[PDB]
Symmetry: D2
Subunit: 489 residues, 4 copies
């Protein structure tokens, strides 16, 4: 068996927007992402799937059944997000705070108790109360709660993504506006102030790199505001760094609990030995730039004392690798591997690819954990790992294999504190809609019933034993190819 420490957390991660709606009274129309996915032009263009989150899995109403399943599965932790748009559907700009802003730089944001009280008057009571209800229930199952403050949607008053898509950059511009940093610090303080008694650890945000990158660079991904603008991507990146740091400080003014961040990772593997330098450049550009900012205060060639040391732990999201080839002194991502595979194809390495076209590459998770650990020596939590797999064909192997790799990291001295699968149940996969099914539990979107995939039973074994048991260790292997789609050669 491959045994984990007794305190090691096995759980799941979940987003508000992806999972909450679907039950009566749950609809939240007041986010950029909601507007974005309902936009007729986006739908007609195929930027978004045409599926809508209000037809989703209904965690808002059915949370007890989600928690029931998690408890039955032996899960001891959940990282779940709250939605800013629900809590502050109306603007909070007029709540005065003490913020030192020097042009593009937000150096501090102090949120007084008076401001918190004014925010409380402005907050949506049903929303914040409901979060307390859901998270209290969660805790009542013996599930440790990691609260993630931001998981992409912004209140519409902060971002009109259609206006921005259209190039009206005077419209509310989301992470292109330093105001959003300040409002986020306010929001983060407020949520900690309200909910801290339920929270074990905080994350400020989930995968900010996807926000800036898909929002402004990889615009075929259909993410808001889908405004192809490299400068904008950088501006959003910087504002997300600043938002993280200012939220860290605001939350720490309320609570001394650990405050971290959750980030989208790939293992950047060189196509050949000659591409090792290129792979390192990719890692820097795509990973260390953000972390060196919030850990070391290094951003854009200068060091900011107001950014340094603003991280207590690192949430590693990991799905697959990116294979990197040198291109001059730059680099390029090699198609056919990693995230760039044929959906339900096979990479040139012989690794099957998920329903999303993501390559089976568990070894990457060890590498990413090791690299983060060696660089910063901050505690690591695997905050996402999973697979789009409607058939549960690859998932059992995917699950055990990746858990094994976490064990390897642990054995080698990485302080990894848990593994959170993405996700307990199927949910709304953003621009892809509902057809990308990442759950251990299948969701019937008509009935809202949860259904256990066999991988859920495998995860129960792992979670209840805190081990890859002898019975299931064989799943630490690559899915046999013959029965799977071969894709195209």
């Amino acid at each position: 068996a491959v045994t984990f420490p007794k305190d090691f957390l096995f759980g799941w991660s979940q987003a508000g927007f992806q999972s909450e709606m679907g039950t009566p009274g749950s609809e939240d129309p007041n986010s950029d992402w909601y507007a974005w996915v309902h936009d007729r032009e986006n739908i007609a263009a195929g930027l978004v799937s045409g599926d809508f989150p209000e037809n989703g899995p209904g965690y808002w109403g059915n949370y007890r059944k989600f928690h029931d399943a998690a408890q039955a599965m032996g899960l001891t932790a959940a990282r779940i997000g709250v939605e800013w748009s629900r809590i502050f559907p109306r603007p909070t700009f007029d709540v005065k705070v003490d913020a030192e802003v020097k042009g593009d730089d937000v150096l501090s944001v102090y949120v007084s108790e008076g401001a918190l009280e004014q925010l409380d008057k402005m907050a949506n009571r049903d929303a914040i109360n409901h979060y307390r209800e859901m998270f209290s229930d969660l805790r009542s199952r013996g599930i440790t709660f990691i609260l993630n403050l931001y998981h992409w949607p912004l209140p519409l008053w902060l971002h009109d993504p259609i206006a921005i898509r259209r190039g009206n950059l005077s419209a509310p511009s989301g992470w292109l506006d330093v105001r959003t940093v300040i409002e986020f610090a306010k929001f983060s303080a407020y949520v900690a102030w309200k909910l801290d008694d339920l929270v074990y650890m905080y994350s400020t945000m989930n995968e900010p790199n996807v926000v800036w990158g898909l929002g402004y660079a990889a615009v075929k991904s259909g993410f808001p505001p889908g405004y192809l603008c490299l400068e904008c991507a950088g501006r959003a990146m910087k504002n997300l760094v600043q938002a993280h740091a200012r939220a860290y400080d605001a939350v720490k003014a309320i609570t001394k609990k650990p405050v971290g961040v959750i980030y989208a990772n790939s293992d950047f593997t060189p196509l050949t030995d000659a591409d090792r330098e290129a792979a390192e450049r990719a890692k820097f550009d795509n990973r260390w730039a953000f972390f060196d900012a919030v850990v070391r205060g290094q951003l854009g060639g200068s060091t900011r004392d107001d950014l340094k040391g603003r991280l207590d732990w690192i949430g590693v999201n990991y799905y697959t690798r990116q294979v990197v080839r040198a291109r001059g002194s730059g680099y390029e991502i090699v198609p056919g591997y990693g995230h760039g595979c044929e959906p339900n194809g096979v990479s040139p390495a012989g690794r099957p690819c998920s329903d999303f076209g993501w390559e089976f590459y568990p070894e990457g998770l060890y590498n990413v954990l090791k690299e983060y650990w060696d660089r910063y020596h901050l505690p690591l939590l695997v905050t996402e790992n999973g697979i789009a797999d409607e058939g549960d064909y690859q998932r059992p192997y995917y699950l055990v294999s990746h858990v094994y790799q976490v064990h390897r990291a642990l054995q080698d001295g990485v302080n990894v504190i848990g593994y959170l699968h993405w996700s307990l149940a199927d949910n709304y996969e953003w621009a892809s809609g509902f057809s990308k099914r990442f759950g251990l539990l299948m969701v019937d979107y008509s009935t809202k019933r949860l259904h256990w995939r066999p991988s859920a039973f495998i995860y129960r074994e792992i979670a209840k034993s805190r081990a890859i048991t002898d019975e299931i260790e064989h799943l630490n292997s690559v899915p046999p190819l013959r029965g799977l789609s071969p894709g195209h050669r």
Copy 2:
């Protein structure tokens, strides 16, 4: 949930030759099938895989671990075979019995206590004692035991399959010789006499239709003696009928426990409505001919009182269908469906096909059960159902779907007394060797360790609850195609 009666049996089936060998001291070289699969010409021709049973899963030595797994899985029954070749490695012809033989017809075989004693003197003691040991252990787990007397291999003294393949029909000729019927009655009496205290129900034989059909007609299948001879197929068929009837009588002279037979079934589905008559002709030729003989005494246009009423229950093996098309007043099996599909392909009905090229067709199991029930109203046991599936891609769906169909039969009044999956663990699939993996448990043929596939955990749910639970009912569905091999169009 889909709930079964409290007495309903969930278990597994297993063959001696397929599962026993692999541990030291287990090798039994003294069967036709052993000679057959080691024959160099057969191997070179690709008639057999080149894999050998002595490299198998090792139930002979490791039975306790098989039983441990079954018990952990909640299984309440096992149908397991004994091997004639192990018990009587040397000829028993000289043991006198009272047999009325009129040419080709063996009308009676009475085995006296004196004969049983003489047989006991000739029997291999280690073999019979070891079977008692294994089956006693099996019973000690709360597992009901259905003993199946014959599961294809014959002692070599009864059948030199290489000589017969070569056309030397004066060599020991297996089921071409009425002597084999008589020796089988002796063997069956002997085994019942020795082991009855361990046995709940007896089966005389497993899939005799495969024996005669693959042995003498479908010779590319690589089954012994692989002597292409339609008359021989019929002769073997008749001798297997007679063997069944004479074993039934011999066993009943010792014990009043139920004595049945286990048979290979397909649902014969008409390609179009116009093929309904053709499908009925196929059912008669391939199924009712045997059963009308052993139930109604009807064979070859005449009725034999010595055949009538020689069946207490029917073991339904079922894997897939055969699609039938009229061809004149005859019929033909339509390729691309049923058993004749591309391995890991998809049929024209959109049904995925197993690693063996067998179509996903759970509805067939209901039909076969209903048809047997309507015709004979004898108790039915699903004695095999499973899938060759190295990845466990289709099996979870296959399992639940077929169990559901058994429930449907039950609900409609069919007396089906249990469901036995083929098989608990991977084993030697005859001419196909080890690459056809039917286990709920994967076998590592190097280490002999058993490994739980996720389907094993699903079956545990079913067996422990005697139900398709709400959590797993969704698996009563066709595996999603996109992620599976599409085959060729």
Copy 3:
């Protein structure tokens, strides 16, 4: 054999931007499309392939070899475009013409001889002379020349597609600006004035529906300006209608030769009988709206005498169908058929799909020809038909099948005057770059050599005989599926 009239034209079609560059001295950087495909953000986003037209097949320098091949193949016609950007790299706004503009409506544009002379002073001499050279050579081979004035790229002075993508709608805005209509009339007059002696028939433009639709609606296609704006799509559509009408008039003021238009067509086939109305709505929206404007003067619910009767012939481009399903009183295009198939997949109708994911549907060409003929009774020329097929797997069948369908139309009384394959040679497929290979001749982009695919030899048979000969008629069939990619199910 399937024989065509002696005057029936067999030839090819070709675009300037797609085929001209690749030889020294050919580079034309002065178009929107050139800027667009070199734009770093577009490349990084995957909107465009990263391939560049200057690395193309080199018709500008190597035209004689293209013509040699066409002549060897027996081709009697070519429709080839000229590039506005080459001819007028600098703005022509200051050339005064008499234009009646009432807001959005350009009712007339008269281009005086004085204006033509002023244009001639402003024109790029090398460009216009070179076109004369190439087209004179073309004619010297016995090849009839259909000159197409516009095939998507605009001079950059008329359209800064990056500025528009960014939402700076005050930048030169291409078909969003009525000025472009007027400049196009000037350009069209100028080209006719210069080149008419070489021209048999004129087309004003190629597939304007792709320009407006991909430019402003189907923005994932990576066409300029990629500004998602439904109103803009309509504005561009109207301006392309007006441009067509004003070019028709301007060309007719110079020459009485036939002036037509070339349009992207699909056969809109109803998924079920219940979708017939929906299919008709699709045809109207996607086809009749434009043609009723330029034939009947009907646009936007009003009739314009300045639009009526502005068409002498219709160039039918046809590649595949679109399957249409009713959606309320609207309609939707059914994925998996037509243009929306898996690249190298197979549709649900069993029709193989090209390297572009376009379904094999030759019957559509008959339908489209018949429908146009029944509606307008204007002469039809199949101005494009071909397939992206790097292996020449489907093309031989595609070619003969579609030619057969043209014959069927002819036999039924449609005045179809010829068939022009897209294309003689591989070329730059817009945002897809060079990997979509439509040639009868394969191009080696390194050496610029032309290579005959077997389909070229089949087309030679057709063209030289003006018939589908007895030897090749069997190719009027669907490519056998077994050997082709099956795609995913």
Copy 4:
């Protein structure tokens, strides 16, 4: 261009049994192969396809149209077989000849003019006259004729393959009987005596290695007599050696024209460098054993002066390779490459596989030619090369690639005198029936019409130019994989 010498022959090869029947009056029921493929047990077993040669392409009646096509294609040679069964449907044993037989060894057979006259009295006049008619017509087209005496079927009076399959080895036993050697010498003399004026070169037999190997070893292939017997395979091999030598002598007693043999070849390629010795052992066993016998007189460890020097030229049949791995001091053929690939799959080398599962491996043809040339320095004729390819997907590439390799051999000094494609038209592929389509011309088996595949037009280019022309040289490449079936991984 890749140019061949002016005398180099481009043509086709054809078998009597595979191509003759299908027209009224052509049916020849009097061969082992005819009986074999009509045998009900064989059909039911799937040993043979159920297709029958009498439904074939009808060369017997339609030869002029075959020749017309060949002439239109520019072909200058044909190797065509005659059928012993047609010429001597009744036994010729009673025609006395002078034969020195020492047990198994037939050391000489002298056929006197008197014997020839007696044979002529016994011959079927319609058959021999008809062959003269067909071959005279062939010659009238400028086509050089290579007559091949034997191409597998034997007269039934020499071989009752069903009796032998059944193990009745006292029945007429074909190549298991030295009598067949003697009768073959008689037959060969007779045919040369009758037809020599039409013949340029003789071949005694086609692929005798397939006869002995598939007949008695690879019995799943469904070749007669399908009697699994390694000793028999060796006996048949020796008798085919002897038959070749005695036919050589008998033909040389009549004519001094070149007498050769046609043999089934593979390039035996080592899987790794460590398998080079194993590959050499495979070549010896499968190729040099026969040729060292008929060239060097070396057979079974002894040298026979009556075998030495009995070969004037070597007919190389080549389709694909066999990949060989050492297995101890033996060797094994590696599945998934060469002849052992998935039909319409792709090998691990990335080479597409034909409809027969044969890997695209043109380099093998050079190797085989070079090896034969280096060993014996006898003139070589590529007597077969082609592909089962119903779609003509791979064939154009297959054709040009293999022709290129013949050129390479020539350039390197191999005396290769021509290239004969298998085949001009589709025909009956033995146990596989009609679905394996090897023609440059597709045959419609209903109408008997011949249809030109595009590869036929490519071959016309080659044959008329005696070159791989510049236009088609690109086809010397591997078919692009993306559009083809990927098979299974």
